[PDB]
Ligand binder design. Sequence first.
Ligand SMILES: O=C(O)/C(C[C@@H](O)[C@H](O)[C@H](O)COP(=O)(O)O)=N/O
Ligand SMILES: [Pr+3]
Ligand SMILES: [Pr+3]
Ligand SMILES: [Pr+3]
Ligand SMILES: [Pr+3]
Ligand SMILES: [Pr+3]
Ligand SMILES: [Pr+3]
Ligand SMILES: [Pr+3]
Ligand SMILES: [Pr+3]
Lengths: 340, 339, 344, 336
Amino acid sequence: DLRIKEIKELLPPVALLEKFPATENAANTVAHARKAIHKILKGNDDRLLVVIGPCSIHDPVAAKEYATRLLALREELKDELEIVMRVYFEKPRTTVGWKGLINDPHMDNSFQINDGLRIARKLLLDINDSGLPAAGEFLDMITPQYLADLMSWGAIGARTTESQVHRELASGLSCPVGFKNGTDGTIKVAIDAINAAGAPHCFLSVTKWGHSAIVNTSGNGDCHIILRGGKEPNYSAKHVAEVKEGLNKAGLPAQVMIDFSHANSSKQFKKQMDVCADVCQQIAGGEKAIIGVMVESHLVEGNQSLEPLAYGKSITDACIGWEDTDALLRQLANAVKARR
Amino acid sequence: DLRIKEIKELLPPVALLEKFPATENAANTVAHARKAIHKILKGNDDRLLVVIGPCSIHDPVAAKEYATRLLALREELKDELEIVMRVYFEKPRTTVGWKGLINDPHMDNSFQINDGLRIARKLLLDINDSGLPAAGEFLDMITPQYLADLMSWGAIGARTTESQVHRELASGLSCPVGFKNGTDGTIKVAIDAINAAGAPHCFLSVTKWGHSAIVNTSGNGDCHIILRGEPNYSAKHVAEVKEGLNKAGLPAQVMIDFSHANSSKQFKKQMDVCADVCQQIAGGEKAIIGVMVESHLVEGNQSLEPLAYGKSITDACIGWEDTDALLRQLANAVKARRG
Amino acid sequence: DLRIKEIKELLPPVALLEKFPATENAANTVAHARKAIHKILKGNDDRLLVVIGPCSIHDPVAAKEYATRLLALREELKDELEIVMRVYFEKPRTTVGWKGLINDPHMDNSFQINDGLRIARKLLLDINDSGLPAAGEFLDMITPQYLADLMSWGAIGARTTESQVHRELASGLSCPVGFKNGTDGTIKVAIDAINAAGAPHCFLSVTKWGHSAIVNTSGNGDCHIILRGGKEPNYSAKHVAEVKEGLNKAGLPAQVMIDFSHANSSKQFKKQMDVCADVCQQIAGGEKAIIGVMVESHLVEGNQSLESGEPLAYGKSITDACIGWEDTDALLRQLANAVKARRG
Amino acid sequence: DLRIKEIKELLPPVALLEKFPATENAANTVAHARKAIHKILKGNDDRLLVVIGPCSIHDPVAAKEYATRLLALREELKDELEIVMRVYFEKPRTWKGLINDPHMDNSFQINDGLRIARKLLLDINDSGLPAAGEFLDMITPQYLADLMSWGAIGARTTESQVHRELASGLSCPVGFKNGTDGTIKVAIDAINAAGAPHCFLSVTKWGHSAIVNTSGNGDCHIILRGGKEPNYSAKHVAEVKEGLNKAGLPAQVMIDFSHANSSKQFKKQMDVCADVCQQIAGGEKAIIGVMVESHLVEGNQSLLAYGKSITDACIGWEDTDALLRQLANAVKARRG
Ligand SMILES: O=C(O)/C(C[C@@H](O)[C@H](O)[C@H](O)COP(=O)(O)O)=N/O
Ligand SMILES: [Pr+3]
Ligand SMILES: [Pr+3]
Ligand SMILES: [Pr+3]
Ligand SMILES: [Pr+3]
Ligand SMILES: [Pr+3]
Ligand SMILES: [Pr+3]
Ligand SMILES: [Pr+3]
Ligand SMILES: [Pr+3]
């Protein structure tokens, strides 16, 4: 009505799925990575899930370069690390800001969202087709139909871990999903989310044809917590123990994924290397509860603001550079061989 | 989609708008109320916005009797109060329970949402058509298209004040919106939410036709905080909130939720909160621009065999006699603050 | 799309069905009438189906006045006639012209089709709720979803009996369907259509949600020919016998509905009474194959034109000329008398 | 809905458009061919439109082989003939085609048939061979009409208001067949109705019903296909020309060599060719086009052999080369 200025046409998921179908290789990649993460979340596999990549995708060419480098390390460190690339097309803002490649691919408030979906699905498809699994945050309620079939692992953001519609979304997603602890370090909201997402739900959603409908979900038991800090970090064994106690109390597996960035690094990118030190000591000491980690990495460390932009630098959160990334990864895989 | 078991047809919004179109009376009710709340939020009216009514509606018949009683008080106290009926269809919770009138109108877990939507719109239509404005809660992104044209005020869920998708929704709502503070009593997320909601946004949404589309909003400047709690209705807390709002550059105004934490989960304590808030107002507090009270015909609650008439099946409410006294307490207070 | 000037929002059928649901009595009218026509078609009832009423609906008020009068005769004559009102909202044109109430309800080329659908369904609902069944021509491929649940009988026009998409539509309609012979008098196109409509089909159509979809139909066994004349009228006994033998050779029951109007009256509205006199003699003489008739009838006889700009007369056709109410009463009593004589 | 058994999902047009967008080559083929046919119909080109190809496409491989052979004769005889391939994906009966049942088994895999048909049309146009189609359905056109340079309304639907409405909004020129009996009145009526603007309900590229308004289509003409007796002779053209002139329309005609004009015999198409060539070479400027049922192999088959029709019987490639050259020489003599 009065506060809706304009309404514009939107391609339906089925149109993106027809233009950019999954290649056989892409399908195989997704299936294998999901099965491997299920094996890790059920304890049958001792390796570590590493979700690593840019805070946000804004340049498909650099992403293709990053993916080529990360894919090499995935094949080399595969005995200790299940590497999944961060391919974030959606970004939650504390108040306002650039919301990601889908919402605004030209970074200029043009909102060419149909091109955003075309660009994002094609990049996601090419990455998977090369053999590299991909991960994203599921923030929007309507975009998942265009992308989810190419997602090997998903995240629910700290500012939406408490959101019913997002817990419902998780309960129907074909991939494992991680829920961030609240902005204040509150762990309870995430356990409740894991519990909710493991149950069936009945709710309103949008179909592959772009039409609203009633949807019934089965429940997703491949769900786990992601520690991302609060006013202070929470990546330490002590914190891990507290969390593992809350998980056992709730009838849930005492498994944790540790995010080296955001509140766990105080928004200082280089601090991810020190969080890595601490977590690697926990693994080498015997912590089987750390089943995964998450790292904000890019070709060039730091971040830049939004006219032409520097190559390989994040336009959102500051990331560690590739050299630090190659090193961080070997450290993690060294700690995994020690724990084994 | 291997964790999606079934997909069933949903009536498009235009089907419910064609079946239950707004009468001229209902449309006038909504327009007048929205204007009145804007005037209060702009500091151009010294009257108190009162959103009052059941925790959740589970019986349209009892809701219409409530609306008749409340309408009478709305006319008697209009010089001091802008009375809006709380027409909430669900109690958001994580534990198991009735999913509300839209999700489960027959209260049996049959999830007859088409039926629920029909019942909800018809009730909203009837209440507005009688002259009583209605206030709702926005818990998802798809049902507002069926109902918001009959809402004069809305509240975003407490568990979603932080969510970008709910802030995007508020940016394009035609009615004023209240954002609840944090479970710790902090006001930062609600300030972030008011800022975000006041900005223009572009996002994906379902249209009146039942199809996803791209929508651009203007931003909603009629948003405010709701203080809902340990309790935070006290004058110290109100001063603290006013300070945070002034520093953030927002108007130092607040709506106070008398129920839940602010009442330590004891329905009768809403009368204690009322006594305190009335004290703050009569002494001169102009920041308190609204209140929220959980009220029904019959006080208390019951668990969902027949049910007691007019008694909440969700959270406990004050009953009509207390409601009549509370509203007179608030009105006498508005007279005092004035002169 | 260089020749598509404008595209506009259309209410989906679920909106009209939700706004105007069938009442209990309306649904009863439709179900009873369809069953009664099925019975006549199977040879288990000796009554005459009579489809009668305006060439086109353009005024809901006159249409309801007409319906009330017709309903009273429907009740009075129901041992002899199964009376169904023509409630035609769609008109096929020889070239160009007003396409009917749905396409253009204000009759001024404003094409307010959403209001037309609303006006049309509400009228169909009021007429059925009163107890009077309704008949229409199925011309448009999208409008049936808005109306077909309130239709007891349908016609596929002379210009579309040959059309594959209309034969497909008929194969999935829940009501009996009449196929008019071709505009040049050809019977075979009508027999082919009956056989086509009796078979299952798979085709593209629009659902009640206004979306395209793939539909599978079961086939419609309640189809028959309508005799509407060609270069010359084809209502006489010589013509009915050729149609009877033509139908049997194709393996179909020798049954016919005769349209008294259009080419069988040589487009001279009062000649419907001359056809009536001949068809009555045939029926009362023992002709069982004549299972129905069709008559263009209004409150006031004649027609009038919209081209004038003059205010329209009440109760008078803006399309084909029609007989007025007095002749209509006399004609229905003639038919009932003949059906009684056929029996005794 | 007692007589409706099942309702199955259908890809919206936007899905097939996104999967199979028009190459710039395809788009240019379409545009140039449409503008050239306009020029023939406005009488500013003495060239002859030739719509030629199989009665029906059942094998995309054989259809692409035909397209290749025909493109050669197209560029060779371009100064006399505007050659457009007949790519007929919907068939009228009383098997509805590759779109309705691509695998030919009553499996009715229409989403696959739509995918196959749009791909074949896109490939043929990308090559430089414009395509011609029959418009039988009101929904299929939104998935294929962008790749069509000319279209026909079948004889069984010339009289139908809903097909005239569709014709009035098509971006391509349209031919209307005379009805089964040699009479042109329904076809003259159809040309007049399709020339006028119309408002009607249709399905958009998004798969939703909506109200559309059309401008009218002035690029419509008659197609003589005969009836009980053939109507391609000079006497017949003259009668049709007088009828057209009385109705107020350009006195122009396309002549279908097959069907009744051939009395259901594929070799008689060569005889009609003889006759029409004699008429054109004698100075008949009113014959602006012809239609021939041609395949790589001659004849037909039922319920397969390669490059042979499973519908109407067609002429083989040798006869096809000969006929195209005959028409070209005839148009050369008309010009000279
Ligand atoms: O209603 C019927 O049963 C019909 C349709 C008939 O009413 C037609 O619509 C006009 O006679 C055409 O009028 P024009 O020839 O002026 O376009 N039978 O043919
Ligand atoms: Pr980040
Ligand atoms: Pr674009
Ligand atoms: Pr409550
Ligand atoms: Pr129901
Ligand atoms: Pr008529
Ligand atoms: Pr209107
Ligand atoms: Pr053929
Ligand atoms: Pr397939």
